[PDB]
Amino acid sequence: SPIHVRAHPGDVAERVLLPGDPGRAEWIAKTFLQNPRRYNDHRGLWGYTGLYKGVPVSVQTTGMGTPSAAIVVEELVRLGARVLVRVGTAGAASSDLAPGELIVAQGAVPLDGTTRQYLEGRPYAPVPDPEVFRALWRRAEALGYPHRVGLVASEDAFYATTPEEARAWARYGVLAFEMEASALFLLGRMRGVRTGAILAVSNRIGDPELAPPEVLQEGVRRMVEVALEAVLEV
Amino acid sequence: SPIHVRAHPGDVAERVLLPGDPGRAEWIAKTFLQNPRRYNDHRGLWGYTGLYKGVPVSVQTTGMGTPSAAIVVEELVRLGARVLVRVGTAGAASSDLAPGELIVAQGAVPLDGTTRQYLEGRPYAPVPDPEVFRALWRRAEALGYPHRVGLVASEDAFYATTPEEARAWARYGVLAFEMEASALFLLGRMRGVRTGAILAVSNRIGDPELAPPEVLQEGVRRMVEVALEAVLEV
Amino acid sequence: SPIHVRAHPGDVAERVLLPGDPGRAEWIAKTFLQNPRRYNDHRGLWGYTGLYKGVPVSVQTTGMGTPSAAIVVEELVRLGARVLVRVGTAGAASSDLAPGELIVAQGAVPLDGTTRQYLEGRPYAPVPDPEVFRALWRRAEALGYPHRVGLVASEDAFYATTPEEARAWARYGVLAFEMEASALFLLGRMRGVRTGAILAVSNRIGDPELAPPEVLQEGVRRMVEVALEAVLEV
Amino acid sequence: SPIHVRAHPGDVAERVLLPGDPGRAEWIAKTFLQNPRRYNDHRGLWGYTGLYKGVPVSVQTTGMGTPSAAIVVEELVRLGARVLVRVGTAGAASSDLAPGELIVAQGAVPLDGTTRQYLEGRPYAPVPDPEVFRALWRRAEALGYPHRVGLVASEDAFYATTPEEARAWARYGVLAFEMEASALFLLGRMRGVRTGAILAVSNRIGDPELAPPEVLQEGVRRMVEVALEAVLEV
Amino acid sequence: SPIHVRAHPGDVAERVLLPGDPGRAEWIAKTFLQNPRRYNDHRGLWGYTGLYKGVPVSVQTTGMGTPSAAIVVEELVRLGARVLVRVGTAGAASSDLAPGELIVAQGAVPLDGTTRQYLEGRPYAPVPDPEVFRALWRRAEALGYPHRVGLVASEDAFYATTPEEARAWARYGVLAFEMEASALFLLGRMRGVRTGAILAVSNRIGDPELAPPEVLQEGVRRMVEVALEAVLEV
Amino acid sequence: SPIHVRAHPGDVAERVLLPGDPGRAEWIAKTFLQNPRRYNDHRGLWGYTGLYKGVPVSVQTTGMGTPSAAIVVEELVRLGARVLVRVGTAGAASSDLAPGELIVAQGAVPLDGTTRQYLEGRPYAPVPDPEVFRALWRRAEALGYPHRVGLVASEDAFYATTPEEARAWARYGVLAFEMEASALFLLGRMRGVRTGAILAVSNRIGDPELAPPEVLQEGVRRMVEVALEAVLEV
Ligand SMILES: Nc1ncnc2c1ncn2[C@@H]1O[C@H](CO)[C@@H](O)[C@H]1O
Ligand SMILES: Nc1ncnc2c1ncn2[C@@H]1O[C@H](CO)[C@@H](O)[C@H]1O
Ligand SMILES: Nc1ncnc2c1ncn2[C@@H]1O[C@H](CO)[C@@H](O)[C@H]1O
Ligand SMILES: Nc1ncnc2c1ncn2[C@@H]1O[C@H](CO)[C@@H](O)[C@H]1O
Ligand SMILES: Nc1ncnc2c1ncn2[C@@H]1O[C@H](CO)[C@@H](O)[C@H]1O
Ligand SMILES: Nc1ncnc2c1ncn2[C@@H]1O[C@H](CO)[C@@H](O)[C@H]1O
């Protein structure tokens, strides 16, 4: 059994969703999955498995940061995960993005040391699996939810980025900041598995608090629904 | 008039194709465009403009390497370019990519110094414009032309990369090596224009020569058609 | 109330133990603290406050990785944390360090990207607060529990480091690898709070699994006992 | 037969001048060479061969940037080039260097990615061949043409450098900016050939346009004379 | 016999004091030791050996800069040196340190190139041997001499660091700047010997001159006394 | 009066030779200078001033390593030094350089941290003053001494470079390793003074000991002579 996600042979399904927060994971399992069984709770890394419209689907908590997320991904791939789609939140880098908006990550700027350690310092363009990416973009369009497509930046120091630095990054195409995408995408190519990421803007860089819970929840629901319909596509 | 691409308002169309080789530019102009006209030949940067299915389309040579293409792109943008798609060739990094095969660039690892200078050393994930990327992908499918969608690595030193170094990059998802995409993608986001890149494999890194004209030529023809159909879509 | 550790000023004591796993947090609260109360469970970041020999002591879960821990330390300081001692586990860099042995961290090689982001790429020597470091070393001696005093290395990629790379680092004095210390030490200096770190070796780098519960539990119990005794000393 | 400069050993003389602009290459062949013959035009990399004062000399275009130049240089060496002297233009970094003034590159600061890739990140001091350097310096003195002997900077991003960044570099000895010297000098030492570079200042960093056609043209004329007189002396 | 410190077997004692200035090495030997004997003077790297309270103690000059210190340390170790304590001067970074104050180095920020070359660019936390660190601290207290325990920064360019930068580093815990600590600490771990460092602030960064030889002198005597007591403890 | 080289303006001549070894500075003074007087002995940095064929000439010790050398050079410039020429030894990186052979430094690969700190990490090509370099070159030929003209590499860790790395560097043009020239050349440009460097190969990289006293002493004498004759022409 893996060191952190202590699950067994058949616990994890080929299709997995990766929320960073264990609380969102739980909500997804109860709200969208039939016959949900929690196969792991060690280290608060709640992971569940059930059926979504007849297809087996897993929901695994990654924790915050790429160091934490990388661990979960590597182990999920060992357990059998084939398609892993992250469903998280992000802080808008600019002002054209408003809380509640969705982001289909086309790529993730690697500002984290996890991808850096796996790459031994080499440059790199973390991008999701083209198919998964395409699937997320279609489903989002299909459902008709206000969404954006483009770059996000995966960082490590949540509290080190200043609004001014956020603006500087936006001039480079970064729509928002998060802390897991880059490593996921990198591992996707390294371990030969299909990955993707869709985010829900929960705040603007610099905000002392997140957007009103109502606004937030609605974006999360839409995001999860897109991700779920998308994972079935591939 | 710009310092390198000495063209005047009206010469360059909104839609532009960016081949690295000026000989191909000439060929594309005569072969696909009605009433082709060469608006620039300074420094060998042969740039044409004609109509493709009634729509204005320009074909501007970039030269080899990001330093060169950067110059061409920055200036084309000043002149009015809004949608720029590079149609070049690349060297297979892996063994599954067969010469002649097409690659729709989903992202470009930045191993060049041009992106490094524009970014001041900051990490980055060069990606094409989502819409353009999407259009290129779809058009390839609609035309029934086999294709690969993925990452390419933009490098500066053509003769530096060893097959062993290539296989290493292939393990990170790099399909092939070329020398212009990264800066195109970066400038795309920096200047607010939509870019893209479709490449025709012309060899497999390590090869003393390129591939047989005929096998590679049909690839080049398809690439251009896809690229032309795509720029009219967006 | 902070964004991640949803608590208030009066919920956190001046002295805080920082385990990485919420499971140990809960275990410490119930096993060592009198009248322990959980002030947070958001994101699984389990936090407890109670009394130890009459002195208020908080036990906050940090999660895995400096990005997670940094978010948690920044917020604990905001909430009035003054003395923070990490009580975690680590992987031995050499064959001579056996599971269960204790390590009083004299410093932490910064291999993570979190410290890097805060330091804007500048070199640095992550070190504990001198008085806390000395307090941990003294209690360990006063209690008659064997221990090692030295350097540990804070990394981002759990599954990148191979046994050969770890032993190479051992030549430079690295006793073990873990994933939180460096940032804790850095933030200690940046935010002006006393911090320290004590670890219990739970495995040798490269081991498929961790050591058997009993062997490790006594080391963990000892570690926790030393930490609580040391925080009351400062 | 090289992949880019499609010539064969024998088409290229041991003495070669390396202009960036292909039109300048043509001008030099028809102007100073007897029985000029173009041996390559592939990729617009115009190359000529003829006699200068009874000695065989080649004028090969390199294109803009160290990526393009490194390719041409690597192939010219294959074709058997022994002495290669760059004859280009440059943008003044200081305010004392006026358009039309000549520079005998004593060294070239490597700000490009080409040399970086070749050196694998290692620091380096790009310098010409001692003798070529001396011959150029001597010939410029003899012909009594006002010149400067010092450092130039080789960059990748033409439109990135600002007047302020240039003045800053001037304080370190950088006399002017260009885009090929560094790679030429590096490759010279690596492939066992003699290289050198003489430049004619055509503008000041930040200038929207080059200097008057007339003023610039004379400088180019002296530069070539100096270069031709020099390569014949080694 | 070593290349620089031309001593013979047995000349060097197991415990060694390392002043950067030969003038100070001479003074220490003739002031605190019994039967001071000079075993080396080649390259001005004055080294003495005598008895401190019946124990053999050496005082080896290091010179300035980590490159010089590194040579001396390497050769001393190769000669049998076991305990090496640096006794030098430093430049205060903040106003929180006055001239004449003693600093017991807890660690040393590696801003130098020597540590960098030995580490091949890898991050690192240079610290003293724990016991030597502990001893230095313990003796300072037992002798009633005021002192500070914290970080110092080891740099290369003495005349480059500005007061503004120094204050910046202060925000990260840097108490003062010196030029040998980092390499000594690193070599201590690599070479398996016990090192440590105590410094006497002799000025503020930016000061045109060093503090009056009076206020400074008492600080230096205290520093040397503590270091002597210390090396005997280990 | 400077902090390290405690001399008065009149003490230092416009022309200065900069040997690293204080013992050689003395030998130079007593062997080539008429009426030589020592103006400094503080920190072992022995400095002398006398007459060479009627012209005032100073001989100032630099110590080992760019850190120490930069200090000395900075202070000499502030004292009035106009022409500074290093006269030292170096370690051959290849087999075609025998001990006792002379090298006129055309440039110096900056492997040191001092130049790095002064440059704030920017790339660069340490080169001497054109005229000084020319004079050094011309004199060596005039006195008919066997010499090489090319690159050296200034390093920080004397004991880190392996015969293998030395050879790798040799393929890039490096003839020998030393520890001062790079910072000298950089400062020469920054402070507006004419610098130069000439070395006498005294060993091969990896040698336990230096060559026989006589083979090397003749090289040193020729080197010192060429430097003297040279500074008199600048
Ligand atoms: N402003 C922000 N900066 C970084 N990560 C953010 C932000 N807002 C939300 N997140 C996401 O949620 C967590 C931080 O609250 C991270 O896991 C990250 O992916
Ligand atoms: N193996 C290869 N490596 C780098 N660039 C290549 C390769 N094959 C084709 N190219 C493309 O064509 C040029 C090099 O011939 C570059 O402009 C690049 O875009
Ligand atoms: N071998 C190891 N490598 C890295 N971190 C380790 C190791 N063993 C235990 N840890 C610690 O526990 C977690 C990984 O299980 C990390 O949070 C880290 O601090
Ligand atoms: N200001 C400048 N910046 C960079 N390259 C310049 C400049 N002026 C002239 N050049 C030279 O000419 C080309 C850019 O026009 C490059 O190949 C370069 O060598
Ligand atoms: N301001 C300062 N900056 C750097 N080193 C200093 C300073 N003051 C004293 N020193 C120490 O003494 C020498 C410089 O005089 C160096 O060896 C260093 O360790
Ligand atoms: N092999 C070598 N490596 C580095 N520096 C050397 C070598 N041989 C002689 N030196 C020179 O002499 C000193 C080291 O003894 C340095 O100041 C340096 O300039």
Coordinates of N, CA and C in Angstrom, one line a residue, chain C residues 15-110:
Chain C
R15 N 2.7 29.3 22.3 CA 3.5 28.1 22.0 C 2.8 27.1 21.2
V16 N 3.3 26.8 20.0 CA 2.6 25.9 19.1 C 3.5 24.7 18.5
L17 N 3.1 23.5 18.6 CA 3.8 22.4 18.1 C 3.2 22.2 16.7
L18 N 4.1 21.9 15.7 CA 3.6 21.8 14.3 C 3.9 20.5 13.6
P19 N 2.9 19.5 13.8 CA 3.1 18.2 13.2 C 2.6 18.4 11.7
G20 N 3.0 17.5 10.8 CA 2.6 17.6 9.4 C 1.3 16.9 9.2
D21 N 1.1 15.8 9.9 CA 0.0 14.9 9.8 C -1.1 15.2 10.8
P22 N -2.4 15.5 10.3 CA -3.4 15.8 11.3 C -3.6 14.7 12.3
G23 N -3.3 13.5 11.9 CA -3.4 12.3 12.7 C -2.6 12.4 14.0
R24 N -1.4 13.0 13.9 CA -0.5 13.1 15.0 C -0.9 14.3 15.8
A25 N -1.5 15.3 15.2 CA -2.0 16.5 15.8 C -3.0 16.0 16.8
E26 N -4.0 15.3 16.3 CA -5.1 14.8 17.2 C -4.5 13.9 18.3
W27 N -3.6 13.1 17.9 CA -3.0 12.2 18.9 C -2.2 12.9 20.0
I28 N -1.5 14.0 19.6 CA -0.8 14.8 20.6 C -1.8 15.5 21.6
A29 N -2.8 16.1 21.0 CA -3.8 16.8 21.8 C -4.5 15.9 22.8
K30 N -4.9 14.7 22.4 CA -5.5 13.7 23.3 C -4.6 13.0 24.2
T31 N -3.3 12.8 23.8 CA -2.3 12.1 24.6 C -1.5 12.9 25.6
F32 N -1.2 14.2 25.2 CA -0.4 15.0 26.1 C -1.1 16.2 26.7
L33 N -2.1 16.8 26.0 CA -2.8 18.0 26.5 C -4.0 17.8 27.3
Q34 N -4.1 18.7 28.3 CA -5.2 18.6 29.2 C -6.3 19.5 28.7
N35 N -7.6 19.0 28.6 CA -8.7 19.8 28.2 C -8.4 20.4 26.8
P36 N -8.0 19.6 25.8 CA -7.7 20.0 24.5 C -9.0 20.4 23.7
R37 N -9.0 21.4 22.9 CA -10.1 21.9 22.1 C -9.7 22.1 20.7
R38 N -10.4 21.5 19.7 CA -10.1 21.7 18.3 C -10.7 23.0 17.8
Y39 N -9.8 24.0 17.4 CA -10.3 25.3 16.9 C -10.4 25.3 15.4
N40 N -9.9 24.3 14.7 CA -10.0 24.3 13.3 C -9.9 22.9 12.7
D41 N -10.6 22.7 11.6 CA -10.7 21.5 10.9 C -10.8 21.8 9.4
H42 N -10.9 23.1 9.1 CA -11.0 23.5 7.7 C -9.8 23.0 6.9
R43 N -10.0 22.4 5.7 CA -9.0 21.9 4.9 C -8.2 20.7 5.5
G44 N -8.7 20.2 6.6 CA -8.1 19.1 7.3 C -6.9 19.6 8.2
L45 N -6.7 20.9 8.1 CA -5.6 21.5 8.9 C -6.0 21.5 10.4
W46 N -6.1 20.3 11.0 CA -6.6 20.2 12.4 C -5.7 20.9 13.4
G47 N -6.4 21.8 14.2 CA -5.7 22.6 15.2 C -6.3 22.5 16.5
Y48 N -5.5 22.3 17.5 CA -6.0 22.1 18.9 C -5.2 23.0 19.9
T49 N -5.9 23.4 20.9 CA -5.3 24.2 22.0 C -5.7 23.6 23.3
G50 N -4.8 23.5 24.2 CA -5.1 22.9 25.5 C -4.1 23.3 26.5
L51 N -3.9 22.5 27.6 CA -2.9 22.9 28.6 C -1.9 21.7 28.8
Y52 N -0.7 22.1 29.0 CA 0.4 21.1 29.3 C 1.0 21.6 30.6
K53 N 0.8 20.9 31.7 CA 1.4 21.3 32.9 C 1.0 22.7 33.3
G54 N -0.2 23.1 33.0 CA -0.7 24.4 33.2 C -0.4 25.5 32.2
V55 N 0.5 25.2 31.3 CA 0.8 26.2 30.2 C 0.0 25.9 29.0
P56 N -0.6 27.0 28.4 CA -1.4 26.8 27.2 C -0.4 26.4 26.0
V57 N -0.9 25.3 25.3 CA -0.1 24.9 24.1 C -1.0 24.5 23.0
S58 N -0.7 25.0 21.8 CA -1.4 24.7 20.6 C -0.7 23.7 19.8
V59 N -1.5 22.8 19.1 CA -0.9 21.8 18.2 C -1.6 22.0 16.9
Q60 N -0.9 22.6 15.9 CA -1.5 22.9 14.6 C -0.9 21.9 13.5
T61 N -1.8 21.5 12.6 CA -1.5 20.6 11.5 C -1.0 21.5 10.4
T62 N 0.2 21.2 9.8 CA 0.8 22.0 8.8 C 0.5 21.5 7.4
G63 N 0.3 20.1 7.3 CA 0.1 19.5 6.0 C 1.5 19.2 5.5
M64 N 1.6 18.6 4.3 CA 2.9 18.3 3.8 C 3.5 19.3 2.7
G65 N 4.7 19.7 2.9 CA 5.3 20.6 1.9 C 5.4 22.0 2.5
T66 N 6.4 22.7 2.1 CA 6.6 24.1 2.6 C 5.6 25.1 2.1
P67 N 4.9 24.7 1.0 CA 3.9 25.7 0.6 C 2.7 25.7 1.5
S68 N 2.3 24.5 2.0 CA 1.2 24.3 2.9 C 1.7 24.8 4.3
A69 N 2.8 24.4 4.8 CA 3.3 24.8 6.1 C 3.5 26.4 6.1
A70 N 4.0 27.0 5.0 CA 4.2 28.4 5.0 C 2.8 29.1 5.2
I71 N 1.8 28.6 4.5 CA 0.5 29.2 4.7 C 0.0 29.1 6.1
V72 N 0.3 28.0 6.7 CA -0.1 27.7 8.1 C 0.7 28.5 9.1
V73 N 2.0 28.7 8.9 CA 2.9 29.5 9.8 C 2.6 31.0 9.7
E74 N 2.3 31.4 8.5 CA 2.0 32.8 8.3 C 0.7 33.2 9.1
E75 N -0.2 32.3 9.0 CA -1.5 32.5 9.7 C -1.4 32.3 11.2
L76 N -0.6 31.4 11.7 CA -0.4 31.2 13.1 C 0.2 32.4 13.8
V77 N 1.2 33.0 13.1 CA 1.8 34.2 13.6 C 0.7 35.3 13.7
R78 N -0.1 35.5 12.6 CA -1.1 36.4 12.6 C -2.0 36.3 13.9
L79 N -2.3 35.0 14.2 CA -3.1 34.6 15.4 C -2.4 34.7 16.7
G80 N -1.2 35.2 16.8 CA -0.5 35.3 18.0 C 0.5 34.3 18.4
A81 N 1.0 33.4 17.4 CA 1.9 32.4 17.7 C 3.3 33.1 17.9
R82 N 4.0 32.7 19.0 CA 5.3 33.3 19.3 C 6.4 32.2 19.2
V83 N 6.2 31.0 19.7 CA 7.1 29.9 19.7 C 6.5 28.8 18.9
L84 N 7.1 28.4 17.8 CA 6.6 27.3 17.0 C 7.7 26.2 16.8
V85 N 7.4 25.0 17.2 CA 8.3 23.9 17.1 C 7.7 22.8 16.3
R86 N 8.3 22.5 15.1 CA 7.8 21.4 14.2 C 8.2 20.1 14.8
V87 N 7.2 19.2 15.0 CA 7.5 17.8 15.4 C 7.1 16.9 14.3
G88 N 8.0 16.6 13.4 CA 7.7 15.7 12.3 C 8.5 14.5 12.2
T89 N 8.5 13.9 11.0 CA 9.3 12.7 10.7 C 10.2 13.0 9.5
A90 N 11.2 12.2 9.3 CA 12.1 12.4 8.1 C 12.7 11.1 7.6
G91 N 13.3 11.2 6.4 CA 13.9 10.0 5.9 C 15.4 10.1 5.9
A92 N 16.0 9.1 6.6 CA 17.5 9.1 6.7 C 18.3 9.1 5.4
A93 N 19.3 9.9 5.3 CA 20.1 10.1 4.1 C 21.2 9.0 4.0
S94 N 21.5 8.4 5.2 CA 22.5 7.4 5.2 C 22.0 6.1 6.0
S95 N 22.7 5.0 5.8 CA 22.4 3.8 6.5 C 22.6 3.8 8.0
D96 N 23.4 4.7 8.5 CA 23.7 4.8 10.0 C 22.6 5.4 10.8
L97 N 21.6 6.1 10.2 CA 20.5 6.7 11.0 C 19.3 5.7 10.9
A98 N 19.0 5.1 12.1 CA 17.9 4.2 12.1 C 16.6 4.8 12.5
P99 N 15.5 4.1 12.1 CA 14.1 4.6 12.4 C 13.9 4.7 13.9
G100 N 13.3 5.8 14.3 CA 13.0 6.0 15.7 C 14.0 7.0 16.3
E101 N 15.2 7.1 15.7 CA 16.1 8.1 16.3 C 15.6 9.5 16.1
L102 N 16.0 10.4 17.0 CA 15.5 11.7 17.0 C 16.6 12.7 16.4
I103 N 16.1 13.7 15.7 CA 17.0 14.7 15.1 C 16.6 16.1 15.6
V104 N 17.5 16.8 16.2 CA 17.2 18.2 16.6 C 17.9 19.0 15.4
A105 N 17.0 19.6 14.6 CA 17.5 20.3 13.4 C 18.2 21.6 13.7
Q106 N 19.5 21.6 13.4 CA 20.4 22.8 13.6 C 20.2 23.7 12.4
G107 N 19.7 23.2 11.3 CA 19.4 24.0 10.1 C 18.8 23.1 9.1
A108 N 18.3 23.8 8.0 CA 17.7 23.0 6.9 C 18.1 23.5 5.6
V109 N 18.7 22.6 4.8 CA 19.2 22.9 3.5 C 17.9 23.3 2.7
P110 N 17.8 24.4 2.1 CA 16.6 24.9 1.4 C 16.5 24.4 -0.1

